[PDB]
Design a protein that fits this description.
The complex is a heterotetramer, with two copies of chain A and two copies of chain B.
Chain A lengths: L3 H31 L3 H25 L10 H10 L9 H20 L1 E4 L2 E7 H11 L3 H36 L5 H6 L14 H13 L2 H18 L10 E2 L15 H4 L11 H5 L5 H14 L7 H6 L16 E6 L2 E5 L6 H19 L13 H15 L2 H7 L12 H13 L2 H15 L9 H11 L3 E2 L25 H19 L16 H10 L7 H8 L8 H6 L1 H10 L17
Parallel strand pairs in A: 3-6
Antiparallel strand pairs in A: 1-2, 4-5
Helix pairs in contact in A: 1-2, 4-6, 5-6, 9-24, 12-14, 14-15, 15-20, 18-19, 20-21, 21-22
Chain B lengths: L17 E4 L8 H4 L6 E3 L11 E8 H4 L10 H4 L10 E6 L1 H4 L9 E3 L36 E3 L12 E8 L2
Antiparallel strand pairs in B: 1-3, 2-4, 3-7, 4-7, 5-6
Classes of the chains: A mainly alpha, B mainly beta.
The complex binds 2-acetamido-2-deoxy-alpha-D-glucopyranose (5 copies), 2-acetamido-2-deoxy-beta-D-glucopyranose, chloride ion (CL) (2 copies) and zinc ion (2 copies).
Protein name (chains A, C): Angiotensin-converting enzyme 2
Subcellular location (chains A, C): Cell membrane; Cytoplasm; Cell projection, Cilium; Apical cell membrane
EC number (chains A, C): 3.4.17.23, 3.4.17.-
Chain lengths: 597, 173, 597, 173
């Protein structure tokens, strides 16, 4: 028949074939990840290889269809997703070289290790060696050591590779009709044909940067506070008007200032929102953690966990004997088979984490109706965003009281609202500038705008200008610090984390609005809500099926990314901060350094 | 002689479902009235006895059972087994994960996904000829040619709407 | 010295003297209205005669000042406010007859009593006897009785007097260079010399009728809906297409449909916005009610009540023994002496009233800065409007919770909201037509477009036509139903209620805008909003010193009044009504009647 | 001999204010330090002691007390009692509703509302001549002729700024 009609039939045949290969592959991936056997790591490949090799075969066949000559959004969507020419647009030499790079970088990072200069006997791997230093050490020089070792070894190493990586990856992008690789990535946010719901690879940067402006005041203060705080922690090493020594930031990069809480706590007298002990004091097992989580979702209107979930999930470490990987993940294998892998400890951070993960699972369930190629979050940001909303409503003292882990006598006083909001901003708000800047550099580095002989001289041109952070020791183009951060030297889009962060704060607002919630936004608990779930399930049932703009509209009532709600969450902290900073300096001079000359 | 249909060791594929003729028999249906070993049992006729029959057997995916009923949308009901509009008796189903599925993958069960026009109530198609959306002979590898018959893939760890269900459809005239 | 200079000293002399007489007059008037003794009724007159006699003395004396020959707006106003003629423009024989009328009428009304036809022992006085019947009886005939007896006795009586009242009062007006007494009253709204701020006595009618047209759609529905509802209440007595029986409107005239609530409530299963019972169940006294409203004003930035207020006001009927008039009034006796006179019942209707009354008192206070002759609302409508703005914020479910009359848990949803809106309409939207219609008939019976032999014939035409109300029995020209309402037979301008209701929402819009408020106007509560409080005061303190058009432009930005805001406050109820009425005839027939059947 | 001033059974009207000379005395002033019985106590000088004076007595309206200080606007400070610009001691005032006010109305207290020119600091004027804004003799009935001295009218029910306040002004030299 037509070209449209011919296409339906192709996509159809594809689905049913993909479903079988895809499932076989997950089942493989999983078994390996729950049971690290050699025979398993063998099949984890086989199945993943057929899958990937079938994907190619299909993509290149899917190429024989003009989607421009197709007027049925749904079909266009899947067809075009499948029209993933990918690295197959390069010559066989490029494509193999590239994979070697992508791999080599991946390897170096995971395998990298630095050794004690005056005790070369013992070396540390980033995890958990260096990491635990960057997270716990109050020693300026020990912290400096790790920080500088890591970037000077496994950093300088990824430099050469990264340069070539950029070239090879750019050609790939150019050949597929993108301005650059940056343009490629920004692609994820694009929308064509719907009106008002249309969105462009350009209009990302535009929105991203505009949204970020209205974040400076909140951050500048957050900054201002922690600085004074850090001045006491490392007296003499910091300047009241200067940037923050990058190695004094809580982790190997300062991606999150989370670990600064210990020494930036507003009122160290106040006690606990940490039911870590309230759980242990109640003989809570991995079963209760999740059964509870289920109940949560059930309350707002969503379904039980499929019996499959209970029969198939791994919730507690099998210990030794049968060892496994421990990263918490939500598995959507296919053939309506969901499950979670999590080495469940009895931390509140895990009871919370249970929720974030099962958020995912519920999302995975909700869109199982959609055709195979549309089952996934509206964008990279949506899926994590839904994860967090859950984490959020459960962490409220109110919900904890509702459960009965928190003594139904706790007085939620004005000051406890602050230690909470600060421990929050330290993670949620801390990471925003950091995250923006990083993709600001990449984005520019992929448009030649940042010449090779200015890569590092430019990292920190923005590490100071944007983030308010400095290098404790100076770096020339021999270094490649950005590549010492996972996502960078592992080829992952990173802006995802900004839009995610932003998104979630609209979701929560719009849901606490519908959940009819009175007090401050951060005190909100969508449990026992229903009309809230409904408003949520409306965008959960689509995944990639409609433009995110619509999906997002379904829950908030607006077509775009809004920072306002994020700010509302932190408005009570912001006011306090401003007053705190009464006599401290707000802002930073770029020119100051912890090394001088 | 009904327990020689539901209880028979193997079952057909929907694309080639088996009709068993039963005449001059007398049975109680009571063997069926009392059954929690039964996921579905919608009787588009009644639920009484006269001790007088057609028994069509086959296997479908969970979320496919929904189609073994009059006026149902398609794919399974469109190209494999199409119940009649009013005319009816009973549709009976039951999960068989241990019997028809394996943790490793069981793909013995077939079903037809492409065709030229829907089947008439109670029609059958055993054809197995490479298919092109506009008639014409077909010779795969060739493009726009597909084999009409596809495999189910009943893994035991799958979701309920993805597990094997044996279905028996009784008819009265 | 000049001519203007001579004037300055004259007015100064006036102030110091007037304040001394005006006060003794008010203190007399008070002691009477709170204690109806015979020695009291005496001095009430005396001081009030010395006052009015001194005013006359002064008026003719002010007459000797050319205000045309004066260029200081402030002075011109007061001088010319004093260049008044009043009823002194008539002859002695008329000016006594008139006062005798005005007194006879006033008396008849307050002393009227109907007695049970089949029981000439018991009699009831309008308040609280008839009134209670009209506000509570579900009995068609009992309500028919009251309604008809009142108009039959105390009505047929006022008839002659009113006819003469019309004459002598017309003369009074004409002799003062007015068209009729109607023109006189429409005088209040006039302004000359300012450009764009000028307003003519005719431009009122024009604006009023115009503005009113835009209310019809909304009122017709209200009507349509309460009709249906009333059909269930009074099965068989109403026509699906006919007007509403006057005796079934919740009070003695239908001035307000407020009491219809109990039997027209949209969602009875919801938790009642009539906190009347909540108040009763919580043992609230008159004290709590007033101390409660004071706190409200305090919260927006206004002052407590003068300790004098609390020692002098009369807040609960002394009962029998020492008898007093009950109409709720807000007294500005002078010499900074304020008080309220109200026989506070523990109703909700009365708690709202407390605020409207206390509203006036705040306005009285706010312009005690002004010279004696300028202490007064911008126009007649302003003071009532200020009262109502208060009455508005206080009656929202939001405020209700804040107070404690509504469960802290209360879940404000679309059904409660319609309940609250439907109620607010019964009062606010209900009077609009009633009041417009009343004043039209009156205005007409002044320009004498209505002859003595149709006086009623025409009134009921306008009830049927404008208000969609019909009289249950026929009324020949012996009747004088308009005078059955205090305001008429007690000689009071009435359009104020209409104009007032418009300003109400105009102010409310801009006040909530000033209070940085969320969404729907009807949901706004200006409590705790110094910003909003402050704004109102800035127009409050201007007394009559400003032309109402300007002062109204200071707050809302409008040379004139506008019906738009009102219409928005009611949009939800408008669209919800529109639906409800889908199975009803909307509108009426001037032809149906319960008597001509 | 202070308790002989504030405690004097009666007090004068502002236009006719009373000056009492106090010399060759010793007083602790602490009779004045130790007082909440005192609504106004501004001392445009000090608040210590030298065990050493002129007391000025008179009555005014609440809202008129704000004029018993230097640099003040008018009417009372203009035509009755003008305190000297810098030159100053203390100004003391206290509410007297129960004493100089009556529910029936109390008008004994006078004040000059008209005049030809401001008083100098500590000036006085007991005059009572019909006033006209352009000099010229006066004889009311006649128009534009007013009597300078008007009555206060102190009612017990009135607002605070309309209640009587006895005021004593101490001066040093
Ligand atoms: C919008 C539209 O064109 N309708 C259909 C859609 O309902 C269906 O799911 C799809 C499957 O091939 O085909 C078309 O897209
Ligand atoms: C300078 C001038 O002419 N202004 C005066 C003002 O002082 C006074 O308060 C008012 C009353 O006479 O009139 C004018 O506004
Ligand atoms: C100063 C003011 O206007 N507020 C006070 C308030 O502080 C006090 O506690 C209350 C008790 O009488 O009365 C007043 O409302
Ligand atoms: C309108 C309203 O809710 N009033 C609140 C009251 O609830 C609260 O006790 C007080 C303390 O912050 O502030 C406000 O006056
Ligand atoms: C009407 C009048 O007397 N004028 C007043 C004057 O008393 C006052 O001092 C000034 C400001 O303080 O405003 C006016 O000009
Ligand atoms: C056979 C076919 O492709 N048509 C279906 C149609 O029955 C359904 O109502 C709608 C949405 O699922 O569109 C198609 O998926
Ligand atoms: Cl870095
Ligand atoms: Cl009437
Ligand atoms: Zn996750
Ligand atoms: Zn009023």
């Amino acid at each position: 028949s037509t070209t449209e009609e011919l296409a339906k039939t192709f996509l159809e045949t594809f689905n049913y074939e993909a479903q079988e290969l895809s499932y076989q592959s997950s089942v493989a991936s999983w078994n390996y990840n729950t049971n690290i056997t050699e025979e398993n790591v063998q099949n984890m490949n086989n199945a993943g290889d057929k899958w990937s090799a079938f994907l190619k075969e299909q993509s290149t066949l899917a190429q024989m269809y003009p989607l421009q000559e197709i007027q049925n959004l749904t079909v266009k969507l899947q067809l075009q997703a499948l029209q993933q020419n990918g690295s197959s647009v390069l010559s066989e030499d490029k494509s193999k070289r590239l994979n070697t790079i992508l791999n080599t970088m991946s390897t170096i990072y995971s395998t990298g290790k630095v050794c004690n200069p005056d005790n070369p006997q013992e070396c540390l791997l980033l995890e958990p060696g260096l990491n635990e230093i960057m997270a716990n050490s109050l020693d300026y020089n020990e912290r400096l050591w790790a920080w500088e070792s890591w970037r000077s070894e496994v950093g300088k190493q990824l430099r050469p590779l990264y340069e070539e990586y950029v070239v090879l990856k750019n050609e790939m992008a150019r050949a597929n009709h993108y301005e650059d690789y940056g343009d490629y990535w920004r692609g994820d946010y694009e929308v064509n044909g719907v009106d008002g719901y249309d969105y462009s690879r350009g209009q990302l940067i535009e929105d991203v940067e505009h949204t970020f402006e209205e974040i400076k005041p909140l951050y500048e203060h957050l900054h201002a506070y922690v600085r004074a705080k850090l001045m006491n922690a490392y007296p003499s090493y910091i300047s009241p008007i200067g940037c923050l020594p990058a190695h004094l930031l809580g982790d190997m990069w300062g991606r999150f200032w989370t670990n600064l809480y210990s020494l930036t706590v507003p009122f160290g007298q106040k006690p606990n929102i940490d039911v870590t002990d309230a759980m242990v004091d109640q003989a809570w097992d991995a079963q209760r953690i999740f059964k509870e989580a289920e109940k949560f979702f059930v309350s707002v209107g969503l379904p039980n966990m499929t019996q499959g979930f209970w029969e198939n999930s791994m919730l507690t470490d099998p210990g030794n004997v049968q060892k496994a990987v421990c990263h918490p993940t939500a598995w959507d294998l296919g053939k309506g088979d969901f499950r979670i892998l999590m080495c469940t400890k009895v931390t509140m951070d895990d009871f919370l984490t249970a929720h974030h993960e099962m958020g995912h699972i519920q999302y995975d369930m909700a869109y199982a109706a959609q055709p195979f190629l549309l089952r996934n979050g509206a964008n990279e940001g949506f899926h994590e965003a839904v994860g967090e909303i859950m984490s959020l409503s459960a962490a409220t003292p109110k919900h904890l009281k509702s459960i009965g882990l928190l003594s139904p006598d706790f007085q939620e006083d004005n000051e406890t609202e602050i230690n909470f909001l600060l421990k929050q901003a330290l993670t949620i708000v801390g990471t925003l500038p950091f995250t923006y800047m990083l993709e600001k550099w990449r984005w520019m580095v992929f448009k030649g705008e940042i010449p090779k002989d200015q890569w590092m001289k430019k990292w920190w041109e923005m590490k100071r200008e944007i983030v308010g952070v400095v290098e404790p020791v100076p770096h020339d183009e021999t270094y490649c610090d950005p590549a010492s951060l996972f996502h960078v030297s592992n080829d992952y889009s990173f802006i995802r984390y900004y839009t995610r962060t932003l998104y979630q704060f609209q979701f929560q607002e719009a849901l606490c609005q519908a959940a009819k919630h009175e007090g401050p936004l951060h005190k909100c608990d969508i449990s026992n809500s229903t009309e809230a779930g409904q408003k949520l399930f409306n965008m959960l049932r689509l995944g990639k099926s409609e433009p995110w703009t619509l999906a997002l509209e379904n829950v908030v009532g607006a077509k775009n990314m809004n920072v306002r709600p994020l700010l509302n969450y932190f408005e009570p902290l912001f006011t306090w901060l401003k007053d705190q900073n009464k006599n401290s300096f707000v802002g930073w001079s770029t020119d100051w350094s912890p090394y001088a000359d | 002689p009904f327990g020689e249909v539901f209880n028979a060791t193997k079952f057909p594929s929907v694309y080639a479902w088996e009709r068993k003729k039963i005449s001059n028999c007398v049975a109680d249906y009571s063997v069926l009235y009392n059954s929690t070993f039964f996921s579905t049992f919608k009787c588009y006729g009644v639920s009484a006895t006269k001790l007088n029959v057609y028994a069509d057997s086959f296997v479908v995916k969970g979320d496919d059972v929904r189609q073994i009923a009059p006026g149902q949308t398609g794919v399974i009901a469109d190209y494999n087994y199409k119940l009649p509009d009013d005319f009816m008796g009973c549709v009976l189903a039951w999960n068989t994960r241990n019997i028809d599925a394996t943790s490793t993958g069981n793909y013995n069960y077939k079903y037809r996904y492409l065709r030229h026009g829907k089947l008439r109530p109670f029609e059958r198609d055993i054809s197995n000829v490479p298919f092109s959306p506009d008639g014409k002979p077909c010779t795969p590898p060739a493009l726009n040619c597909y084999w009409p018959l596809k495999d189910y893939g009943f893994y035991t760890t799958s979701g309920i709407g993805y597990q094997p269900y044996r279905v028996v459809v009784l008819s009265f005239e």
